[PDB]
Design a protein around this motif. Sequence first.
Motif, PDB file in Angstrom:
ATOM      1  N   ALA A   3       0.700  -1.190   0.011  1.00 30.62           N
ATOM      2  CA  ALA A   3       0.022   0.169  -0.163  1.00 30.62           C
ATOM      3  C   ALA A   3       0.907   1.353   0.012  1.00 30.62           C
ATOM      4  CB  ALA A   3      -0.978  -0.040   1.292  1.00 30.62           C
ATOM      5  N   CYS A   4       0.177   2.423  -0.562  1.00 29.17           N
ATOM      6  CA  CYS A   4       0.788   3.586  -0.331  1.00 29.17           C
ATOM      7  C   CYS A   4       0.207   4.268   0.756  1.00 29.17           C
ATOM      8  CB  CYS A   4       0.296   4.563  -1.641  1.00 29.17           C
ATOM      9  SG  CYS A   4       0.905   3.955  -3.127  1.00 29.17           S
ATOM     10  N   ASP A   5       1.212   5.062   1.631  1.00 26.79           N
ATOM     11  CA  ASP A   5       0.831   6.082   2.495  1.00 26.79           C
ATOM     12  C   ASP A   5      -0.258   7.261   1.649  1.00 26.79           C
ATOM     13  OD1 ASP A   5       2.851   8.517   4.183  1.00 26.79           O
ATOM     14  OD2 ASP A   5       0.918   7.736   4.939  1.00 26.79           O
ATOM     15  N   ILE A   6       0.677   8.114   0.758  1.00 29.15           N
ATOM     16  CA  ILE A   6      -0.030   9.193  -0.035  1.00 29.15           C
ATOM     17  C   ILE A   6      -1.488   9.051  -0.660  1.00 29.15           C
ATOM     18  CG2 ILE A   6       0.576  10.708  -1.954  1.00 29.15           C
ATOM     19  CD1 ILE A   6       1.899  11.331   0.922  1.00 29.15           C
ATOM     20  N   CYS A   7      -1.814   7.622  -1.336  1.00 34.29           N
ATOM     21  CA  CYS A   7      -2.903   7.306  -1.849  1.00 34.29           C
ATOM     22  C   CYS A   7      -3.783   6.468  -0.925  1.00 34.29           C
ATOM     23  CB  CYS A   7      -2.704   6.346  -3.073  1.00 34.29           C
ATOM     24  SG  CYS A   7      -2.251   7.120  -4.508  1.00 34.29           S
TER      25      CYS A   7
END
Length: 25
Positions: A3-7
């Motif tokens: 997973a992304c942080d920002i998304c």
Amino acid sequence: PFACDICGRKFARSXXXXXXXXRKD
Ligand SMILES: [Zn+2]
């Protein structure tokens, strides 16, 4: 997956990780 942080969303690994569009927009 990972997973992304920002998304807040899941993706693969993907040499388009060319998403470095977290430097400029
Ligand atoms: Zn992202």
